[PDB]
Amino acid sequence: PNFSGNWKIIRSENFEELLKVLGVNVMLRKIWVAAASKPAVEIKQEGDTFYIKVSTTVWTTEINFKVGEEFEEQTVDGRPCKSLVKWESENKMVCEQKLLKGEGPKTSWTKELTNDGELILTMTADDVVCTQVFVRE
Ligand SMILES: *C/C=C(C)/C=C/C=C(C)/C=C/C1=C(C)CCCC1(C)C
């Protein structure tokens, strides 16, 4: 299908509980939530190759990967990891992450397209699941 587009967020669930699990402490969480949980996402897709830009007001992250091809990126909390993306359906990809150094919670994210226009992100830390919902620009 086509994940390609400029996405803006309409819903966000359990983002604070995600950071709590990740170890961010209370004060930092509250701010992070309030300032930096209206992010912009841009995706350009060339088949099974992905460019992904996620940006706050003063921060940007650029992710590049081919599906099935192991790459390096960051956990939600800024820690470096090895990632691998696989398909689970036509409109849904899944990514597992292994830390580069450290022990830490088990992290992953998924990404799905509805047919009703929605782009759905999940990020997972152990048994907590943050769900963010986007529609197009
Ligand atoms: C396919 C979609 C992907 C890979 C989206 C990833 C989104 C993130 C890794 C979001 C990360 C965030 C931070 C690292 C801090 C600011 C808050 C978020 C949720 C925008």
UniProtKB/Swiss-Prot annotation:
- Record keyword Cell inner membrane present: no
Which UniProt keywords are present, listed alphabetically?
Cytoplasm, Endoplasmic reticulum, Isopeptide bond, Nucleus, Retinol-binding, Transport, Ubl conjugation, Vitamin A
InterPro entries xrefs: Calycin, Fatty_acid-bd, ILBP, Lipocln_cytosolic_FA-bd_dom
PTM annotation, UniProt: Sumoylated in response to retinoic acid binding, sumoylation is critical for dissociation from ER and subsequent nuclear translocation.
- One annotated GO molecular function: cyclin binding
**Do you know which Pfam families this protein is assigned to?**
Lipocalin
Q: Where in the cell is it found?
A: Cytoplasm; Endoplasmic reticulum; Nucleus
Q: Annotated motif Nuclear localization signal: location in the chain?
A: 20-30
The organism's superkingdom is given as Eukaryota
Q: Where is this cross-link: Glycyl lysine isopeptide (Lys-Gly) (interchain with G-Cter in SUMO)?
A: K101
One term under GO cellular component: cytosol
Binding-site residues, all-trans-retinoate: Q132, V133, F134
Q: Tell me the protein family, please.
A: Belongs to the calycin superfamily. Fatty-acid binding protein (FABP) family.
PANTHER family per the UniProt record, alphabetical? FATTY ACID BINDING PROTEIN
Q: What is this protein called?
A: Cellular retinoic acid-binding protein 2
Its organism's taxonomic lineage begins at: Eukaryota, Metazoa, Chordata, Craniata, Vertebrata
Q: Which gene encodes it?
A: CRABP2
